[PDB]
């Protein structure tokens, strides 16, 4: 089915260090997913996040069913030490 994981990132100068796509308002499903992982960034140095990882929660903000900019704003305002709850295809 799906594998679940909890990943705590420390924010860097280039952010958490990945890119996200999707949302309920996305044109052409509705989840927030990782499209890119930045060489040298926090998520790439932590080593656990993967492209196409679906982000389910950011600290305590539920991002399963949210517009694209609410996800982005959820991540921008998560602080210096950021708890990501994610799932991926097993």
């Amino acid at each position: 089915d799906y594998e679940y994981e909890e990943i705590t990132l420390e924010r860097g100068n280039s952010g958490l260090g990945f890119s996200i796509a999707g949302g309920t308002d996305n044109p052409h499903d509705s989840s927030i997913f990782i499209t890119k992982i930045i060489t040298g960034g926090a998520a790439a140095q932590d080593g656990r996040l993967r492209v196409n990882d679906c982000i389910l929660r950011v600290n305590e903000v539920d991002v399963r069913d949210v517009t694209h900019s609410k996800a982005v704003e959820a991540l921008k305002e998560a602080g210096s030490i950021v708890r990501l709850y994610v799932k991926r295809r097993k």
């Binding site: 990945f18 890119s19 996200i20 796509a21």
Partner: peptide, 4 residues
């Protein structure tokens, strides 16, 4: 696609 947004950098975060």
């Amino acid at each position: 696609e947004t950098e975060v």
